[PDB]
Amino acid sequence: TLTYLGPDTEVLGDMRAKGQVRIDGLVRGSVLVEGELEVGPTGRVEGERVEARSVLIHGEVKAELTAEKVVLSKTARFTGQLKAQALEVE
Amino acid sequence: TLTYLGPDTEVLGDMRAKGQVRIDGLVRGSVLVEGELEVGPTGRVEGERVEARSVLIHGEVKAELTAEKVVLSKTARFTGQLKAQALEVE
Amino acid sequence: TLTYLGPDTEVLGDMRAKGQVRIDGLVRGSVLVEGELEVGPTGRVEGERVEARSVLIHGEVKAELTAEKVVLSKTARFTGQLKAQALEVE
Amino acid sequence: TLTYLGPDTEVLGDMRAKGQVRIDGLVRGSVLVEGELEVGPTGRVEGERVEARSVLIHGEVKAELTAEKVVLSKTARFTGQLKAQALEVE
Amino acid sequence: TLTYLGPDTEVLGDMRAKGQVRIDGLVRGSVLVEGELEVGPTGRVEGERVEARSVLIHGEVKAELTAEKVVLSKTARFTGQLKAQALEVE
Amino acid sequence: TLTYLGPDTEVLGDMRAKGQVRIDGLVRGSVLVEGELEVGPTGRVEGERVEARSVLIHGEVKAELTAEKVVLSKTARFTGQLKAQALEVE
Amino acid sequence: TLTYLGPDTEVLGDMRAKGQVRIDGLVRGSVLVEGELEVGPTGRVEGERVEARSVLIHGEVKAELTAEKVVLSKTARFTGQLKAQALEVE
Amino acid sequence: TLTYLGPDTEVLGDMRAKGQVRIDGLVRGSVLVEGELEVGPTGRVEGERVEARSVLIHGEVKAELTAEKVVLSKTARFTGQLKAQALEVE
Amino acid sequence: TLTYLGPDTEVLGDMRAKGQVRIDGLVRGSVLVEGELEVGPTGRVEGERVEARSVLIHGEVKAELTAEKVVLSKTARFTGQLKAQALEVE
Amino acid sequence: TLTYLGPDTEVLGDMRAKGQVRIDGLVRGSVLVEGELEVGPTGRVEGERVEARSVLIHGEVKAELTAEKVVLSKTARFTGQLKAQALEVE
Amino acid sequence: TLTYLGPDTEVLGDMRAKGQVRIDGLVRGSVLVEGELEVGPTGRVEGERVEARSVLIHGEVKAELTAEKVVLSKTARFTGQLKAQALEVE
Amino acid sequence: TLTYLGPDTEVLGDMRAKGQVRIDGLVRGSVLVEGELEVGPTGRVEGERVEARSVLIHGEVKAELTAEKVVLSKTARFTGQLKAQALEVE
């Protein structure tokens, strides 16, 4: 359950994972991880929906994120709708 | 127009400003500034709606944010919906 | 605490501040500063109650003012109840 | 009716006038003018109640003022309650 | 000192003036002018004491007059004690 | 009861009459008529006391007048204390 | 004036008249008429001195009468000294 | 003591009688009856002194009368001093 | 004319009567009756001259008697001049 | 680039990767990896096309395989077209 | 029909069998057994087409395999097209 | 090395074997067994050349037979060239 993607791992579809996810690549479609997510600095996640319980972002995301905790860093970039309950920065 | 509030400047209402705004205090209600807003580290903005063209955040916000550009810092905390076009940090 | 407001900073609520305040805009509601208040020539404070320890007025106030020292200028205009202990003009 | 008092015209009672009244002296008690009142710079009206439709003040007044229009000058000073509908200066 | 009262300028107290005084209205109480007093044809002064150096009467007086020179007219009608040194007419 | 004196009818004493009295002369002492009194223009009544129910004066009186009704004319002259209940002229 | 006194016109002093005098009352003291005197049937003249040019008596006289012509009537009464030049009756 | 004189009983001297005396004539001098004296209508008593305890006069007397009771009638005439205690007529 | 004197009727003068005269008293001076004279037993006529038409004597005469008829009685006494034409006794 | 998926990492799309890939989960769609691919014993790759330079299989594949070297294990299962140049086992 | 070939039984042509066939030798050409085929560890099947309902391989095949079930062992080696419905190993 | 073909095992080529061969099927082409050959009663071997050390025939052969020992049976049939050194029967 140590799922890792990217870079140059372009995927045109909807990933539906569980556990732990790190993303360094490009994703066209929806992500519905049931757990902790990580987005690397080389990551790009475009599409409609992002659902998780914990999201950590270093790259660009263009979707409708829906999680509880959302963490950002200096390299993060977002565009779109965002439903969170506690957004921190570090 | 260098409208500035806080600290100890508690306001129980809906502020509707314009231009450049810095807030270091507490606000219960909606903010509809047509310009640049900044929230200091002592700031707390609860209520329903926050709408602007440029937002820079150091404190707590609990509303339905709807802006274009949103800047954050390390001390920030947010809760609720966020409809932006460019979410960066620092 | 260098609180400054107005003009065009319309607020529909009750501000409850502390320290020193200047107001050049429009306020619908009560002001309860625990310190010095200032109203600019463009200021408008309608509503129920205005309470402070020092009041200096250049604009319009329509409420139940209750302070110790009340200063007026040539541009001032008032409507309503006023309980002071020393009313000066300058 | 050119009713005029003061200086050196101290009166210990409640005046109930009509028309136009000017006071440059001292009055202890109630004033109930049904018209325009004037207070000179040496005038002193202490006591409980002052009722008029127009009051012009240059001296000291300590009572419960209740009028429609109230005008003040640079030498004026007031203490107590003030129920007016239009308080101007000069 | 052109102190003038009356008519319709009723005062309920004890006037203590200086200089020259005319009354065409109602005064209930004592008058203690240190100079010339004048009572118009519509003037009426009831009460306890009237003291002056010169008193001129056209109306009704009900008190204890005490002056040096006392002048009367055809319309006067005094009531009470009168301690003068020269009671003249016209 | 047509009591009439004066002029040249000087009397050094206290007259105590009843009915109606006219005096055109000089009287040194008290007059105590129990009725109407009349003083002519050439009359002089000096002394302590003058008591009547009606006093009409054209001449000089220097005493303590004490009556109910007191009438004067342009030729009258008085000096001293005067206790009346209705002091009229002409 | 035709000086007439009495009745009930009691006088406690010295009358000194001129012309014509009639007395129907009581007189305590001296009479010094420079003319004709008459004492009515109710008249009483007690005292010290009575001097005249003509005295006609119907009442009581008790003094030092000194005149030229003295007339008496059936009702007359006298007591004391009488220095006259023509004492008649009727 | 039925002493009777007059008429035509003219006497140039001083009669000094006692008891009862009537005189119808002329007497030049003093009469000093120690009792009642009578002068008839034809009587004439000129002279200095006439003294008695009771004098009744119908005629002429020119003296200094000094008695207690002196009676006169319509025909009497007197000239001079008269010291009596009761002067009646008829 | 029943002229009668005495007793106790002393006269210091000259009696001059006309008619009938009785004397019971004292006469100091002359008697000149033009008629009948009588001197009672108590009578005394001293003086200058006694002239009459008829004299009847019971008392004392010390004068110049001069009559026509002169009668004396047992009680009579005379001293002086006597010119008569018929001196009888009893 | 040790890209790893599965288990429970279902993806409904076409992955186009590069480098080395291990899969223990489910993939619906085409895979176009430019390198070595590995399918774990729990791995499943259904869809249209799988193209690579080296494929090692422990799970199920139902597609059109096109590689150079193809290795299988005892747990492997395949269905469909396969154009390769070297199919070995273990 | 238990057709068996090999080793050293090379055939340069197209075999068309029916039933069950085992090959331990060399075949240059197409094999068209309509049943189960077996290739021994010494087997070599080159040529164009191999068609059966079951192919079991221990040797080398260089053709277009077309069966339903294809099983391999550790000694197998293949090159070319393979259309199966279940490719297993044992 | 018990090489066996037929029946229904049609082969379109040149078999070149070694050891022992039995054929019950159809063969169009050359046979070059280096040993003992057998053709069953259902066997048919047409073509150019059949070379062996021993040939046993129950079926049909149409070629250039060239062996050492050649055996036939009652059902056998041959057509063509035959180079043997001992052709026997049964």
Helices (H) and strands (E) in chain A, counts: 0, 11
Contact criterion met (CB below 8 Å) for C75 and C89: no
Q: With residue G80 as reference, give the H or E element that holds it.
A: strand G77-89
CA distance H37 to H41: 13
Give me the residues paired with residue G86 across strands: G69
Contact residues, chain E, for F39 at CB < 8 Å:
none
Q: Which two tokens stand for residue G87?
A: 């004492």
Pairing of strands C10-16, B10-16: antiparallel
Interface contact D8-E2, CB threshold 8 A: no
Provide the 8-state DSSP code for I31: B
Tell me how crowded residue K1 is: count the other CB atoms within 10 A of its CB: 17
CB contact under 8 A, H9 and I1: yes
* Residue B89 lies in domain: 1-90
CA dist H1 and G68 (Å) reads 37
CA gap I34, B30 in Å, rounded: 169
Decide if G84 and H74 are in contact by the 8 Å CB cutoff.
Answer: no
Give the up-direction half-sphere exposure of residue I72: CA atoms within 13 A in the CB hemisphere. 15
H45 is written with which tokens?
């008593």
Helix (H) or strand (E) holding E3: strand E2-5
Residue L61 near residue L77 (C-beta atoms within 8 A): yes
Q: Which positions in chain I touch H6 (Cβ < 8 Å)?
A: 3
Task: Please indicate whether, in this complex, the C-beta atoms of E84 and F89 are within 8 angstroms of each other.
Answer: no
K89/J89 Cβ within 8 A: yes
Task: Report the distance separating Cα D81 and Cα D85, nearest Å.
Answer: 13
CB F32 within 8 Å of CB F17: yes
Q: What is the C-alpha to C-alpha distance for residues J3 and E37, in angstroms, rounded to an integer?
A: 116
CA dist list (Å): K10 to B67, I51, J80, L33: 81, 262, 31, 10
Identify from L2, L9, L38 which residue to disrupt to test chain K contact, counting K C-beta atoms within 10 A and taking the largest count.
L9
Question: Length of chain I in residues, anyone?
Answer: 90
Backbone φ and ψ of J9, nearest 5°: -105, 70
What is the C-alpha separation between G70 and G89, in angstroms, rounded? Answer: 8
- Residue B31 has what DSSP assignment? B
List Cα–Cα distances, C20 to B21, C4, G79, in angstroms: 18, 9, 113
Q: Which residues of chain K approach chain L closer than 8 Å at the C-beta?
A: 1-19, 21, 28-29
**Three-state secondary structure call for residue G37:** strand
Cβ separation of E1 and D21 shorter than 8 Å?
Answer: no
- CA–CA separation, H27 and H5 (whole Å): 10
Q: Which residues of chain D neighbour E2 with C-beta distances below 8 Å?
A: 4
Residue of G nearest to H68 (CA): G79
Within 8 A by CB and 6+ apart from L74, the residues are none
Q: Is C27 left (phi over 0), alpha (psi -120 to 50) or beta?
A: beta
CA–CA distance, E60 with I14 (Å, rounded to integer): 90
G11, G16, G18, G23: best mutation site toward chain F, by most F Cβ within 10 Å?
Answer: G11
Both tokens assigned to B53: 């063209």
CA of K21 to nearest chain L CA: how many angstroms apart?
A: 9
Residue type, J59: G
Burial code of F28-58, b = ≥16 C-beta within 10 A, e = fewer? ebbbbbeebbbbbebbbbebeebbbebbbbb
Strand partners for D15: D31, E11
Which chain A residues have a beta carbon less than 8 Å from that of B63?
none
Residue D11 CA from chain centroid, whole number: 14
Cα–Cα dist C51/C29, whole Å: 12
3-class secondary structure per residue, chain C? CEEEECCCCEEEEEEECEEEEEECCEEECCECCEEEEEECCCCEEEEEEEECCEEEECCEEEEEEECCEEEECCCCEEEEEEEEEEECCC
Tell which residue, H87, H42, H83, has the closest CA to residue G73: H87
What are phi and psi for residue K5, nearest 5 degrees? -130, 170
Instruction: Classify residue L29 as left (phi > 0), alpha (psi -120 to 50) or beta.
Output: left
Resolution for the entry shown, Å? 3.5
K24/chain L closest Cα distance in angstroms:
10
Chains with at least 3 CB pairs less than 8 angstroms from chain C: B, D
Residues of E in contact with D10 (CB under 8 A): 15-17
How many separate domains does chain C show?
1
CA distance G80 to chain F (A): 23
- On the 0-12 / 13-18 / 19+ scale of CB atoms within 10 A, I34 is middle
User: From CA H2, how far away is CA I9, in angstroms rounded?
Assistant: 10
Which residue, among I1, G37, C83, has the nearest Cα to G50 in the 3D structure?
A: G37
C-beta separation of J24 from J7 below 8 A? yes
Question: Is residue L53 a contact partner of residue L71, using CB atoms and an 8 Å limit?
Answer: no
Distance CA A45, CA J9 (A): 17
* Closest alpha carbon within chain F to E61: F87
Q: Is the backbone peptide bond immediately before H41 cis, with ω within 30 degrees of 0?
A: no
- Rg of chain F taking only CA atoms, in angstroms: 11
Task: Centre a 10 Å sphere on the Cβ of residue C49 and count the other Cβ atoms it contains.
Answer: 14
Q: Provide the shortest C-alpha distance from residue C1 to chain B (in Å).
A: 7
